């Protein structure tokens, strides 16, 4: 039960940060055509260990499990 509908120029923090990750990862998935995505965006390195390790804990909680954000 819980929307936004507020922007911002840049970034909104946890939120839009773990939105971009889940998103572009998303994307890796589409793109790849694979599955995986935080270690592949990471391996990449698009979005570094910093808030990708943070997005790691935000869906496995740092189980280290793949998929984790894309299909």
């Not at 039960?1 to 120029?9: M, P, S």
């Not at 940060?17 to 990862?25: D, I, L, M, N, Y």
């Amino acid at each position: 039960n819980l929307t936004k509908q507020k922007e911002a120029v840049n970034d909104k923090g946890k939120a839009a940060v773990v939105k971009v990750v889940e998103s572009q990862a998303e994307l890796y998935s589409l793109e790849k055509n694979e599955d995986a995505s935080l270690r592949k965006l990471q391996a990449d390195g698009r979005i570094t260990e910093e808030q990708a390790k943070a997005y790691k804990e935000y869906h496995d909680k740092n189980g280290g499990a793949n998929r984790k954000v894309n299909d």
